[PDB]
Design a protein around this ligand. Structure first.
Ligand code: SF4
Ligand code: SF4
Ligand code: FES
Ligand SMILES: [K+]
Ligand SMILES: [Zn+2]
Lengths: 688, 94, 206, 85, 125, 48, 114
């Protein structure tokens, strides 16, 4: 009923009112050429590459900005349209530098390709060209601004997506220049995305500079593990080497953006790597050895211990296939002390109910919320692409955001209720005025940061936040199927480990210090040798020598997330799998295979021999773990809130203070990014 | 700019040299490691900076159509010189 | 216009008329008839029509396609019948060329056209060798281009470029031996296609 | 003996209706009685409901709950909670 | 004359592929993601089939990337995912199919850049 | 060249060399790039 | 499910051609071992023939069986007519290929392949 009929080269198409001419052409598979237009930015209308003739109208219209009228016939291939494109391309290239051989955009350049398809084949420009001086905006984005075509995409992205108004245009006319005017660094957790959206080689990646050409790269579609968002990525490789990381479009997760850590930390994969098995020699030093020898030493100790004498800690980057393999192996000696470094309160329901520890609303559900209450989190650095989704709803849906915790800069204005945990009781009691906002709200969202649950009184905070969400659901102010309670995780491996029944936190290990400890990529230093008996046998399995490796008796070199096909579950409970981009270096091996091999040598062979078989095992423990890209709903919040009230715990007086207060705290959080020289340059730049 | 490693192997202009424990240097036993001794990074540095009177200069590398594509170099910054991205020649506005 | 290939409407009209002529006379077999913008006539037929259609074009007084220029196959994996069999014929009488196309899959035989054109003998052996299409009633169907005992059909789109085995002389057994292929330098795959449409005239409906 | 309970069910299939009734009515009381026992409830669309029990040294059994009523679910829970396989 | 054949189409015994490169491979069936560096969408029209990545190592002589995987470069193109699945099934390859990701339609309005009372107002052009 | 001498450059060989194949001066190929992956070096003090 | 046959209209018809091919191969091995001056025994050659036939025992499509027989007869013709050389006959035996590891642990020690 609402739809109107327009024509694209005579072919009828029905479009909602407000649809632009360019969008109407998409509907029949015709892509209008563009430079300034990006569907995730505000319309600009300045490049004029999208000019298109409307039948019977004497003047070409900017397809990207012109709303289509009923009965219009859009001539996408008429002589008038073609000459308009040729004329614009001619102006774009008049001052453009003859840089293609030395310019990193070459081979994947929208200017090159649209010149090939829609421009003339020669020049009639007989003058000299403009030359523009370069701007330093930090160690991540190189600027060669003589290549800039003034499309203003970077300015709009910075202002609208990143919420930073540091980019702009200075001057006028042909001398108009894009930059910061003053000497200023564009350091934002989303800054690297301006490299992707810049249509030309004006903005390019500094780490990537000169190393590869697009046609020669192999593209492996994978998943990011630098946080719990689960950003979809493409790993570009050439001749067996990871060359760069690109976003992969996923509307419901990261859209087409990634964080700077996701983009640039990959160079940590080339440093401080574990490539050989190591055992301690007679003098107490780690020395290279064979796989046969290393596993025999581990199997010998494993056969000699049982029950509480054997424990394991999983780190942040561990995959589900390894998590279940290690759990199965320790279960076979009757050990149930499978711990993670990240704490989640086990009071009440604990991990019995997925909805207790999930972002139940989902990432895309933020766009439907009307009020967001953030508790004890700095999502800008804990989940940059999740924070970007909040800002997008803030910008377009007029979302109201309130925060309890340190007044961090979130890139959008919010209501700071304070940092005292006591405010949760006030809101739950109804005395606090913001409680009236939540009652009025139709689709409220309450998000508790996992980083807050790392406090000693995390159970009390979780209960208090749940009590608020239960009042909201008791008030009937919400729809019914809308989910209010949310946990925002920051660790890639956390949700899968909770799904599999791991014990969150290392409390169990501190109660019963084991004689044999497995460190599965555990580099947080939660349990050191001070907390263990004098003779504890420590086995470290991972890909980086960082914290866990130097203290271990045996080192088993594992595979990084780019070197294996492994299952990770993001903060919403959505299972996703990486793909092998390159094989592990040296003698390193796929992590679940190491544990499977160890089980055989120890006379306790695990019942799976292939990736498909261990993924059949995952399905037996938690069926959602094999439903790739699917978000399985979780119910029974009412039952969880009942158990949450059974045991009373006191909030500590400490204010809620997130681990990351400024950008300097964002760049190095795991072993891969700690080994990254690019991340070190970023830290140095933002502090000095 | 050729220098020899502690074991005597010449280092290339790309920095390549076999380390002490690398078996692969056996390939040079009884033969030689071919190394070009005219390091381009050193040779370009010897070229004097060219003083010009305008804000923008152009470089084609010399020889007209025998050089490189013609590019225009902005010389507004006074801290540094303008450098040609193709041939490495340097320019400065007087 | 100096750089544009000129059209030839007279030949386009003649070939179109003959295409309808053939379709009227053998409706039992003709599925599609088309003439390209550079004036090449193609007849697409059901595979049962190979012998009747080729015989008609060879022998009929208004055709007289006495010469088989070429016979070949094309592998198109996305199709249920992945192999397209292409006959290119020449008529000296009418100074004309025609192309006849049919289709088959991995397990359906095609009738050998040796009875119509003796030239088809080796072309069909080549198709069998390179694509694995079996021609029925061939006087002598066997490999023609590949090594003896060679496994697979190299011109299929899913056969790897460097194959599965490679040869070397082995001193221990004092003969050439075949072993799984290992390459000192892997062939470097290039992704060359531009993400921008080149030819609107061929746009497929969405 | 017993080390871990897992219950798989669908969120909407009628075959899991009895398991759904059991969780909403009896799980809370079950958890109170077995405070230190992992009872991993994991919902997944279109899966046949199941009851997995894990005992010492990694021995596991699985009982199907398809089309069970909330009472049969209770019964199956009591059978597992009294076993030491 | 025709015959009746009810068996599932299977050609693994007549394709000549070595056993190792049938059973132990994993074919991925997908529509390639748009290269984020460009706005063109013409490389996202068709379905692709590639295989799992295997080891590449440095050639001792020159340092070139060596491989022993005969399928390392094989990439097939398909009109639909049914065609790709049909091809994978008859060749005996186990496979994963990933559903095509299409950009969701957006609501664009130039006029919103100058909103009287909303946050969509732009501070610069 | 006695009538049209070549253009002089500082990098052109002053001494021509004939084919050196089969001699100790023969060319031997090698990779000109540096090591790509850095291995973690364990500490030099006992501390298991 | 109605397709054009190659030679056989059903499995019983196809299984006859398989047996005829097997007999032809069985009787040719002694002459092959002599003509090509192979160092394998006649029993080895026949044991190899049987092994080649047995890996295809699971086929139930008569058209696939027909092609296997068609290809098997081409291989026999190449051998009887000495179009093959000694190298081609001995390629069935993979004498220079070292035994690849089959169990999980052996494969784990040597590389990454499944
Ligand atoms: S931005 Fe594009 S057109 Fe300009 S120099 Fe670089 S590759 Fe060439
Ligand atoms: S730097 Fe790039 S994105 Fe920014 S205005 Fe210039 S061409 Fe556009
Ligand atoms: S894309 Fe429409 S004016 Fe730039
Ligand atoms: K760019
Ligand atoms: Zn120059």
């Amino acid at each position: 009923s609402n739809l109107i009929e327009v024509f694209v080269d005579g072919q009828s198409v029905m479009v909602e009112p407000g649809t632009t001419v360019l969008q109407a052409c998409e509907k029949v598979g015709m892509q209008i050429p563009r430079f300034c237009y990006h569907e995730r930015l505000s319309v600009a209308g300045n490049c004029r590459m999208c000019l298109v003739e409307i039948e019977k109208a004497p003047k070409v219209v900017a397809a990207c900005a012109m709303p289509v009228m009923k009965g219009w016939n859009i001539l996408t291939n008429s002589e008038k349209t073609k000459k308009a494109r040729e004329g614009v391309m001619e102006f774009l290239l008049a001052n453009h530098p003859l840089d293609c051989p030395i310019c990193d955009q070459g081979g994947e350049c929208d200017l090159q390709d649209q010149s090939m398809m829609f421009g003339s084949d020669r020049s009639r420009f007989l003058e000299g060209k403009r030359a523009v001086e370069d701007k330093n905006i930090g160690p991540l984005v190189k600027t060669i601004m003589t290549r800039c075509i003034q499309c203003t995409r970077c300015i709009r992205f910075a202002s609208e997506i990143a919420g930073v108004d540091d980019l702009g245009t200075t001057g006028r006319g042909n001398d108009m220049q894009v930059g910061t005017y003053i000497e200023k660094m564009f350091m934002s957790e989303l800054s690297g995305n301006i490299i992707d959206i810049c249509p030309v080689g004006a903005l390019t990646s500094k780490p990537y500079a000169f190393t590869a050409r697009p046609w020669e790269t192999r593209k492996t579609e994978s998943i990011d593990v630098m946080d719990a968002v689960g950003s979809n990525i493409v790993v570009s490789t050439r001749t067996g080497e990871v060359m760069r990381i690109l976003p992969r479009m996923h509307e419901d997760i990261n859209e087409e953006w990634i964080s700077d850590k996701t983009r640039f930390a990959y160079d940590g994969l080339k440093r401080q790597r574990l490539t050989e098995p190591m055992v301690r020699n007679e003098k107490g030093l780690l020395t290279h050895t064979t796989w046969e020898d290393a596993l025999s030493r581990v199997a010998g100790m494993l056969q000699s211990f049982q029950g509480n004498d054997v424990a394991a800690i999983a780190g942040g980057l561990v995959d589900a296939e390894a998590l279940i393999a290690l759990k199965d192996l320790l279960n076979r000696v009757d050990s149930d002390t499978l711990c993670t470094e990240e704490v989640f309160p086990t009071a009440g329901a604990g991990t019995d109910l997925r909805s207790n520890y999930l972002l139940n609303t989902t990432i895309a559900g933020v766009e439907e919320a009307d009020v967001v209450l953030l508790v004890g989190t700095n999502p800008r650095f804990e989940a940059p692409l999740f924070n970007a989704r909040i800002r997008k709803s803030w910008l377009h849906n007029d979302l109201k955001v309130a925060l309890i915790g340190s007044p961090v800069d979130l890139t959008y204005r919010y209501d700071h209720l304070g940092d005292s945990p006591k405010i949760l009781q006030d809101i739950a009691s109804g005395s606090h005025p913001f409680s009236q906002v939540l009652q009025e709200a139709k689709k409220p969202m309450v998000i508790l940061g996992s980083s807050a649950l790392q406090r000693n009184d995390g159970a009390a905070i979780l209960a208090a936040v749940s009590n608020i969400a239960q009042k909201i659901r008791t008030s009937s102010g919400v729809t019914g199927d809308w989910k209010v309670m949310n946990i925002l995780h920051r660790i890639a491996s956390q949700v899968a480990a909770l799904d599999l029944g791991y014990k969150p936190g290392v409390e169990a290990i501190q109660k019963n210090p084991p004689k044999m400890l497995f460190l599965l990529g555990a580099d947080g230093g939660c349990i050191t040798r001070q907390d263990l008996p004098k003779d504890c046998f420590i086995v470290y399995q991972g890909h980086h020598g960082d914290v866990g490796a130097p203290i271990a008796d045996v080192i088993l070199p594992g595979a990084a997330y780019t070197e294996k096909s492994a299952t990770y579950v993001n903060t919403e409970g959505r299972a996703q799998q990486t793909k092998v981009a390159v094989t592990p270096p040296g003698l390193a091996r796929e992590d679940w295979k190491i544990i499977r091999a160890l089980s055989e040598i120890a006379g306790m062979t695990l019942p799976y021999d292939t990736l498909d078989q261990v993924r059949n095992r995952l399905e037996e423990v938690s069926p959602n773990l094999v439903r790739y890209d699917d978000v399985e709903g979780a119910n029974y919040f009412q039952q969880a809130s009942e158990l949450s009230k059974l045991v009373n715990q006191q909030l500590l007086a400490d204010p809620l203070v997130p681990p990351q207060l400024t950008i300097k705290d964002f760049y190095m959080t795991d072993s891969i990014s700690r080994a990254s020289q690019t991340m070190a340059k970023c830290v140095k730049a933002v502090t000095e | 700019g050729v220098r020899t490693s502690p074991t005597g192997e010449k280092v290339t202009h790309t920095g390549q040299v076999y380390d002490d424990g690398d078996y692969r240097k056996v390939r040079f036993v009884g033969r030689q490691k071919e190394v070009n001794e005219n390091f381009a990074i050193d040779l370009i540095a010897e070229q004097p900076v060219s003083q010009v009177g305008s804000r923008v200069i152009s470089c084609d590398g010399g020889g007209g159509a025998l050089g490189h594509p013609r590019v225009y170099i902005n010389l507004d910054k006074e801290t540094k010189t303008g450098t040609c991205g193709y041939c490495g020649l340097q320019f400065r506005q007087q | 216009r100096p750089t544009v290939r000129p059209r030839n409407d007279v030949a386009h009209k003649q070939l179109s008329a003959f295409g309808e002529y053939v379709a009227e006379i053998l409706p039992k077999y003709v599925q599609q008839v088309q003439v390209s913008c550079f004036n090449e006539l193609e007849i697409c037929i059901h595979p049962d029509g190979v012998i009747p259609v080729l015989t008609f074009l060879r022998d009929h007084s208004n055709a007289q396609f006495k010469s088989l220029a070429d016979l070949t196959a094309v592998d198109i994996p996305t199709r249920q019948n992945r192999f397209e069999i292409v006959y290119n014929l020449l008529s000296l009488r009418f100074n004309s060329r025609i192309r006849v196309k049919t289709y088959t899959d991995e397990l359906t035989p095609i009738e050998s056209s040796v009875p119509v054109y003796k030239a088809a003998n080796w072309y069909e052996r080549e198709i069998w060798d390179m694509f694995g299409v079996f021609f029925a009633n061939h006087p002598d169907l066997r490999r023609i281009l590949t090594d003896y005992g060679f496994e697979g059909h190299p011109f299929r789109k899913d056969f790897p470029l460097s194959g599965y085995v490679e040869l070397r002389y082995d001193d221990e057994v004092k003969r050439v031996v075949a072993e799984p292929v290992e390459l000192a330098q892997e062939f470097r795959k290039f992704d060359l296609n531009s993400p921008w449409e080149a030819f609107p005239a061929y746009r497929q409906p969405p | 003996g017993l080390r871990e309970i897992r219950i798989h069910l669908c969120q909407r299939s009628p075959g899991s209706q009895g398991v759904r009734d059991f969780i909403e009515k009896r799980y809370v009381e079950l958890k109170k009685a077995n405070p230190d026992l992992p009872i991993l409830i994991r919902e997944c669309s279109d899966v046949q409901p199941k009851l997995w029990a894990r005992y010492a040294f990694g021995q596991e059994k699985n009982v199907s709950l398809n089309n069970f009523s909330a009472d049969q679910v209770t019964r199956a829970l009591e059978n597992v909670l009294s076993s030491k396989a | 004359q025709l015959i009746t054949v009810d068996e599932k189409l299977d050609i693994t015994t007549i394709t000549g592929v070595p056993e190792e490169h049938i059973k132990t491979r994993k074919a991925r069936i997908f529509v390639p993601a748009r290269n984020n560096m460009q706005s063109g969408v013409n490389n996202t029209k068709k379905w692709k089939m590639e295989f799992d990545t295997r080891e590449r190592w440095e050639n001792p002589l020159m340092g070139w990337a060596s491989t022993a995987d005969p399928l390392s470069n094989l990439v097939l193109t398909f009109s639909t995912k049914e065609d790709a699945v049909a091809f994978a099934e008859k060749n005996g390859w186990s496979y994963d199919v990933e559903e095509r990701k299409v950009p969701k339609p957006k609501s664009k309005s130039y006029g919103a850049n100058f909103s009287w009372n909303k946050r969509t107002r732009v501070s610069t052009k | 060249p006695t009538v049209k001498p070549p253009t002089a450059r500082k990098f052109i060989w002053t001494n021509h060399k004939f084919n050196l194949s089969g001699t100790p001066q023969q060319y031997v190929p090698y990779s000109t790039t540096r090591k790509k992956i850095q291995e973690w070096v364990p500490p030099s003090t006992p501390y298991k | 499910t109605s397709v054009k046959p190659i030679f056989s209209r059903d499995m019983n018809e196809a299984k006859r051609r398989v047996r005829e091919l097997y007999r032809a191969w069985y009787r040719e091995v002694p002459n092959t071992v002599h003509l090509f001056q192979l160092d394998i025994s006649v029993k080895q050659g026949r044991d190899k023939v049987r092994e080649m036939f047995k890996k295809n025992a699971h086929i139930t499509d008569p058209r696939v069986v027909d092609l296997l027989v068609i290809k098997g007869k081409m291989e026999l013709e190449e051998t009887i007519k000495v179009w093959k050389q000694r190298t081609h006959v001995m390629r069935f035996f993979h004498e220079t290929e070292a035994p690849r590891p089959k169990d999980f642990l052996s494969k784990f020690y040597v590389g990454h392949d499944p």
